[PDB]
Amino acid sequence: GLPTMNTPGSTQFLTSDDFQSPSAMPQFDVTPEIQIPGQVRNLMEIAEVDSVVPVNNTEGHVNSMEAYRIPVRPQTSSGEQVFGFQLQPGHDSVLKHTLLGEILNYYANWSGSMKLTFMYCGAAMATGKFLIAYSPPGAGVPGSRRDAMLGTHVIWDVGLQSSCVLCVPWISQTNYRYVTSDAYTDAGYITCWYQTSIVTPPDIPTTSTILCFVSACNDFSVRLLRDTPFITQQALFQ
């Protein structure tokens, strides 16, 4: 017959191989596909969808609904911090278990602009302004509003609109950042600051709630598929 020669790499099982195989049930008539709403062709179209971030994860708040509620209230000295978390999607224990972070944890690289949507769930007669800043990694994390006004910020007035959008841009020295973050590729810091105050009329409760949502913009991308470091089983589930 045709003289062949076995190259190295034959008779192996690469688990990510792409080879054909003989069918077990030949000439099988498959039932027809039909219209089912919500066909997903790509995992990034899931990461587009917003999901509310458990910012208030200070135990014991993580076992209840209070982890999603950021408490705001009138102040006596303006310019103080509401919340702030390291921008490590997939690694920081704030938004790692969100819908963006749980998709990111199946990979080892990420690159794209993130979008933070905030929503003031307060009284309709209550007003006030907030400064939502984002500082690039550099050195270091800012420690005041006068320090965290020199980067990228938006000034959200809750009297005008109930929802704000802070589009965190992609300002990096690489093309990709790792999910399990290190000192090489930091991504920066998100903070929020009281611009003026919360000014309410009487007969209004003194404590309110902001929810924070995370999603991915159209330039988001992933790479280097791996196993997720969340689920650990020992034996076969019976």
């Binding site: 000439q27 039909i34 999901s51 278990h97 769930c121 009284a123 007669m125 409760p205 709630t209």
Partner: protein, 261 residues
């Protein structure tokens, strides 16, 4: 180049009024109507078969109003299972017993109003195939603890210890996920600051064209408060939430004696 004749053997491919019948809803200030996964509920095509599908258009597609529920401070949330909450509802439920298979879309209109001096946020979501886990593990639950006949099953703030009920911990949504990730399902946020209502139009979501509407809850409607209802003590206290569902393009087949044994 393919070597075989079967496709299993290939390689990889690398103000505003909404009228339905003799019923109308209000108030809608032309705010937002969410339609499903981008799909409006229509009738079945001829490609999916199968006798004659029965379509009682006007006498069934109308706004049914359920029992109202009290929104307190310590309210975790509630859920209804459809088409089980519309069981004893007019001529919609009479056609369910006399027919074998069914198919329907919905338009769920949840409405909850308050003053300008109130606050709190609801999440009205429509989860398809919400397979709930057990409260007590290795012990299966009864169907009455999942969904009664149009009765609002409520969540809880802590874990349950019921032997024959579902696990009603509201921060795990009763399913096994995080409750903050429920925004991929079709939903609308009720903000007492600016919304006062929510209207979602849901299509028919299943893996089959028709289905027997007794032994399979097609989807559920969860109403979960994320920001709790706080008001001044001198304000009004009773803040009720009302669910107004209407079927849309309901079809049936398999006409026999009245079920459902």
């Amino acid at each position: 180049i393919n070597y075989y004749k079967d496709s299993a053997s290939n390689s990889l491919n690398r103000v505003r009024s909404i009228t339905l019948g003799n019923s109308t809803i209000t108030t809608q200030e032309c705010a937002n109507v969410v339609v499903g996964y981008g799909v409006w509920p229509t009738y079945l095509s001829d490609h999916e078969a199968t006798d004659q599908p029965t379509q009682p258009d006007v006498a069934t597609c109308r706004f049914y109003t359920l029992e109202s529920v009290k929104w307190e401070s310590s309210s975790a949330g509630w859920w209804w299972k459809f088409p089980e909450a519309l069981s004893d509802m007019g001529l919609f439920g009479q056609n369910m017993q006399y027919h074998y298979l069914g198919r329907t879309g919905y338009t769920i209109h949840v409405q909850c109003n308050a003053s300008k001096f109130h606050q709190g946020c609801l999440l009205v979501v429509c989860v398809p195939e919400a397979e709930m886990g057990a409260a007590t593990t290795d012990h299966a639950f009864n169907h009455t603890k999942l969904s009664n006949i149009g009765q609002a099953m409520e969540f809880s703030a802590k874990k349950s210890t019921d032997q024959t009920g579902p696990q009603t911990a509201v921060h795990n949504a009763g399913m096994g996920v995080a409750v903050g990730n429920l925004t991929i399902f079709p939903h609308q946020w009720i903000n007492l600051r600016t919304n006062n209502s929510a209207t979602i139009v849901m299509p028919y979501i299943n893996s089959v064209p028709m289905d027997n509407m007794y032994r399979h809850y097609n989807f559920t409607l969860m109403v979960i408060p994320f920001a709790k209802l706080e008001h001044s003590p001198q304000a009004s206290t009773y803040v009720p939430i009302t669910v107004t569902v209407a079927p849309m393009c309901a079809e049936y087949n398999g006409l026999r004696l009245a079920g459902h044994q």
